[PDB]
Amino acid sequence: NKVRTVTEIVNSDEKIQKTYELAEFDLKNLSSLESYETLKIKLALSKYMAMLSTLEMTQPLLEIFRNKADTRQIAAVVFSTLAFIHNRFHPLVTNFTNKMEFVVTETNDTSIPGEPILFTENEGVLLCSVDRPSIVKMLSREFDTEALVNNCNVRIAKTFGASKRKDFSITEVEATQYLTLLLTVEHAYLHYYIFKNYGVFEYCKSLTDHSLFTNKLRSTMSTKTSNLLLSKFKFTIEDFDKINSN
Amino acid sequence: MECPFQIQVCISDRFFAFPHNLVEPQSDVGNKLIENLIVYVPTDDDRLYIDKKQFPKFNSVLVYRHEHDVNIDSRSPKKTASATIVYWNPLVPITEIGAGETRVFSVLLTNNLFYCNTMIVHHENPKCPIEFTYPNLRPIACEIPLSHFKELVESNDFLLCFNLETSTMVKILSLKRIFCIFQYRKQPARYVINLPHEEIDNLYNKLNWERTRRLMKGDVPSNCATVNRSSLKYIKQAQSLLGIPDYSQTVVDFVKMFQKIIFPYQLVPNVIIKLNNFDQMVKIRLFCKNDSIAISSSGIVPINMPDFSPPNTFDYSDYANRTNINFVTQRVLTDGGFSSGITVTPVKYNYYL
Amino acid sequence: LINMRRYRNAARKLIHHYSLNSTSSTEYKISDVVMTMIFLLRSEKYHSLFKLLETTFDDYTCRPQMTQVQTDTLLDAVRSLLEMTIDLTTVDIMRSSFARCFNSPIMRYAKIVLLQNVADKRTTLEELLIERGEKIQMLQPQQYINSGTEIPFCDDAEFLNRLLKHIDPYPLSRMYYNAANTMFYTTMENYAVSNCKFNIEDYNNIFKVMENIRKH
Amino acid sequence: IIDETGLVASVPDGPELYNPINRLQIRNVLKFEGTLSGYEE
Amino acid sequence: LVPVGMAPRQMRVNRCIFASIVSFDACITYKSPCSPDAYHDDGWFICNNHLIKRFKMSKMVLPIFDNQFKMTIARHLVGNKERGIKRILIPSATNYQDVFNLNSMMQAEQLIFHLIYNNENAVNTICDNLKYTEGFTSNTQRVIHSVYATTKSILDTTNPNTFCSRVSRDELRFFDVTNARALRGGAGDQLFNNYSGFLQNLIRRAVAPEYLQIDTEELRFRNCATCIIDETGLVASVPDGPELYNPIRSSDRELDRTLSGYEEYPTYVPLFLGYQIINSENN
Ligand SMILES: [Zn+2]
């Protein structure tokens, strides 16, 4: 809210009182935090793009996922993303230990809605199932590069305080594609983490209801690991209450 | 652009060096020859290559750097009956004329002289130089080729340099003179132009237009052409893909390699197609002696017929239809187990199948 | 006469939204629906799609029957309109969405709904899990990597800085919105095609979990 | 062999004895999961 | 992949040749010391550190003018009492092998020197020895090729412009003692010609002319020459007599009461030698 300060000389009683409104410092703090988080997320995204480049695949991401024949590259990209997320949670880890299998489904009767990437052991080693058609559909869905997204007082204050500044094939569309892939693989990684550390039955229960994620993860994630990418924003379904009533 | 008939222009590669012998006094209305000669040159340094002693016909000889006189309209230049006026490789409009006919000698043929009525074109047997783009070269001050004349006629690896403030027209004239010297070289000479690629491309375009003007004036065709930078890059890529060392293979020979295919397979080599496309951005057709048909980028065409047959010549509806196209594409996708990157197109046909 | 170009633009935007082919969200109105239908009627190219949608004016709880040629023509028309790829599944999605819109009454407020009635038997998430998992276990790994390995991190800090500069003008808010809605719509399509109820509650529970982890 | 040049891994005569000897990559990805192995070397 | 097909990217580039020095023994890690100045896109193709270490020279700027033009210039690090070989500021192609202790420094730097100085025989000798030394094929070959390619790229960047400058009419430079009535000047221009193109560029960037005629105006920066050139190369010697005192105050009470904040003339000895001529500004 507000505070005030009083200046006074030791030998004198003439005191000068000033008042401060903390809203200004609140704006400073909020702007600093927003900038810091934006920088962190952009750094992570750039790092992801850079390692994918390091793999040195000729085609762009969407073309790669469209090329059904080259399962090799799909598996490479998926594993690299999964390992990147794993390290982002455990920076000291740079490999994945146990070897990994991969399969690329091609039909609805082979895919599971809501979990394009999933895991299942063959009783000896873990296999990652990929819904390449779903990946292609997501990355191909037309994106909005125009509309903006969003207290009016602090909004205006930020508008008037913060400033603005007026050879890569990447547009905002490709950045969005990369972010979507990262988020999907992050969701899959959370499922896999719950699996590995709580058993296949717990993994199935999580698939049924993600809410268990709360405890099964926050026990370790919020404390020791970098926050989830989604943590950058609070997400919600438009007209959620009426939709639920429906 | 208009020119006064009083000017007579002679174009010859030889004019890279001034033709002292060809100069002759002009006569006035009274048929009195003028013993005063005025020689105009594009740059001051050029004066040093004009030997006044080589003008016995005249009694006084003066040399000056021709400069655009903004106060005189070239459509009607001032006349000076007191002297015979000769211009050597002019780069700016002639604002002054001499008694009788004002003589001009040039290795270049710019628009200014292009409309000139009297045009004498000297013909030469072509002799091409070698483009040797590469980062033991002999530097050459292009602004003053005659100074390096001995080296230009002896050595075969030249680094063409220019002063920073050299003008574009000066550059063009220097390059033309050097290329004439190479045209008279018995042995083709390799050269490298120490200039930005875009500047070199513009210079080549202007030289090509000059050669076109000479042809339109009746010059003999010369195979000693030049290649735009994009075309050179494409040729280099092709050579690298084939595993051909660039220094080992010359572009001309590289292209000639496919003449064995041109006629016998009656097909236009893709290299020639790409070069033609580059030039267009800056169609093909050919035949053989006694040949009844012409090979073109479009395929076989009856000689003298348009590049495309009448639209209704062939009916493609049977397969040139969405149903057939989709059927074939789906069959390909299924058989190859593909999901993208597949594209099938109906095949159209020109005059002949 | 009519501004066929404006009609076409409105039709394209409405079709994109109703086919979930664009994360872009904007207001739509009966004016837009009329634009769309008039454009479809006027266009010789799209007569088949016009007929399809017009059939929605009836009970609309029916599966149109088309020859293979008809289906191919319709898909070609739609793909040419949206310039993409597509599927008869998207065709059915548009049919259902437009039928719901046409049957809906004129209202002072927009109606927010969920995709449904796409591709008869209602299946639960548990049944889908069992069946899909069995089929997956039947499937065999197309490819694999060995144990260990090493994540191929980039090294060129200059390259990283160049990429950072290249991405700076991208608003994280817009990118997040686009990605989240892409995933949500693809999940919606999968559920509707599978004829399995979409668990809005769990989908939102995902973000609930995100917040609960963040707060700690 | 030992001579003025020193110690040499050469033969007294005839030809020389036969003496033979992670950065995840795209090639490092293996394909589908699927000869005197029983004798010592 | 992220970047457009090819599309050569644009970034800064370390320019000093010696930045490429690396231990051919991959099992031995080495870092060369480079002054940050190396990352300035200027005529200098050697960083301050290498310059001082190998040539005994320090960079410096000379304001020139209305519009204040900055002319590059180097200065002596040579002490007053140094003699003989120590006075060779930049050795010639006939003496660099001796002035520079090839034995005492790394093979990569020896190759760099035999490249700068046009010593193809030595370059070939080093290349063949490295071919038949250590695990050449594994990574030493690639490292050597990288170093050689970098050096050759720098030299190919420099030499064409150097030759164009040599034959240039508008810009003329004459590295000799402008006091023609002197004996320590000699055919300085001939010796400069003997130098390599890249070495010639370095000399141009380092040694300022005693006089400078711009169009019609001449500026005399010195009434004397602070260095000379002979067969040995660039020599930090006074052409007329006693050497100039070089305190070297850094790097390798009443007086101050009066001399508080107070303009002080530096004791440095810049490089002034020869005549330079230019038409227009070209700046
Ligand atoms: Zn350095």
Swiss-Prot record, chain A:
The keyword Lipid biosynthesis appears for this protein: no
Task: Write down the InterPro entries for this protein, in alphabetical order.
Answer: Baculo_ODV-E27 (IPR007978)
The regions listed as transmembrane in this protein's record are: none
Q: Where in the cell is it found?
A: Virion membrane
Which biological processes are named by the entry's GO terms?
A: symbiont-mediated perturbation of host cell cycle progression
Q: Name one GO cellular component term.
A: membrane
Q: Which UniProt keywords apply?
A: Host-virus interaction, Membrane, Modulation of host cell cycle by viral cyclin-like protein, Modulation of host cell cycle by virus, Viral envelope protein, Virion
**Entry-linked Pfam families:** Baculo_ODV-E27
Q: Give the family from UniProt.
A: Belongs to the baculoviridae E27 family.
The entry's function note states: Acts as a cyclin-like protein and plays a role in the modulation of host cell cycle. May promote G2/S arrest by interacting with host mus209/PCNA, cdc2 and cdk6. The cell cycle arrest is characterized by an intact nuclear envelope, concomitant with sustained activity of host cdc2. However, viral DNA replication still occurs in the arrested cells.
Report quaternary structure and partners. Answer: Interacts with host mus209/PCNA, cdc2 and cdk6. Forms a complex with proteins C42 and p78/83.
What name has this protein been given in UniProt? Occlusion-derived virus envelope protein E27
Source organism per UniProt: Autographa californica nuclear polyhedrosis virus
Originating gene: E27
Swiss-Prot record, chain B:
Keyword tags: Host cytoplasm, Host nucleus
Principal localization reads: host cell
Query: For this UniProt entry, what's an example GO CC term?
Result: host cell cytoplasm
Give the GO biological process terms.
Answer: nuclear capsid assembly; transport of viral material towards nucleus
Q: Which domain of life is it from?
A: Viruses
> Which InterPro entries does this entry report, sorted A to Z?
AcMNPV_Orf109
Q: Kindly list the places in or outside the cell where this protein is found, as annotated in its UniProt entry.
A: Host cytoplasm; Host nucleus
Keyword Transcription in record: no
Q: What does this protein do?
A: Plays a role in the transport of the budded virion (BV) to the host nucleus and for occlusion of viral progeny.
Name the UniProt record assigns to this protein: Protein AC109
What species does this protein belong to? Autographa californica nuclear polyhedrosis virus (AcMNPV)
Q: What is the lineage of its organism?
A: Viruses, Viruses incertae sedis, Naldaviricetes, Lefavirales, Baculoviridae
Swiss-Prot record, chain C:
Subcellular location as annotated: Host nucleus; Virion
| Main localization category | host cell
Gene Ontology CC annotation, any one: virion component
- Give the keywords, sorted: Host nucleus, Late protein, Virion
Q: Would I find Cell membrane among this entry's keywords?
A: no
What is the documented function of this protein?
Plays a role in host nuclear actin polymerization by recruiting p78/73 protein that is capable of activating an actin-related protein 2/3 complex to initiate nuclear actin polymerization.
Q: How does it assemble?
A: Forms a complex with proteins E27 and p78/83. The interaction with p78/83 mediates nuclear translocation of P78/83. Interacts with protein Ac102. Interacts with IE0.
What family does the entry list? Belongs to the baculoviridae C42 protein family.
Q: What is this protein called?
A: Protein C42
Native organism taxonomy: Viruses, Viruses incertae sedis, Naldaviricetes, Lefavirales, Baculoviridae
Swiss-Prot record, chain E:
- From the UniProt record, list the coiled-coil ranges: none
Please give an example of a GO cellular component term from this record.
virion component
What main location does UniProt list? virion
All disulfide bonds of the chain are none
Instruction: State the InterPro entries in the record.
Output: Baculo_VP39
Keyword match Endoplasmic reticulum: no
The UniProt keywords, alphabetically, are: Capsid protein, Late protein, Virion
Q: Which GO terms describe its molecular function?
A: structural molecule activity
Q: Does the keyword rRNA processing apply?
A: no
Reading the lineage from the top rank, the first entry is: Viruses
| Localization | Virion
Q: Relate the protein's function as given in its record.
A: Most abundant structural protein of the nucleocapsid produced during the infection cycle. The monomers are arranged in stacked rings around the nucleoprotein core.
Q: Which family does it belong to?
A: Belongs to the baculoviridae major capsid protein family.
Q: What else is known?
A: Expressed late in infection.
Protein name listed in UniProt? Major capsid protein
Supply the source organism for this entry.
Autographa californica nuclear polyhedrosis virus (AcMNPV)
The gene designation is P39
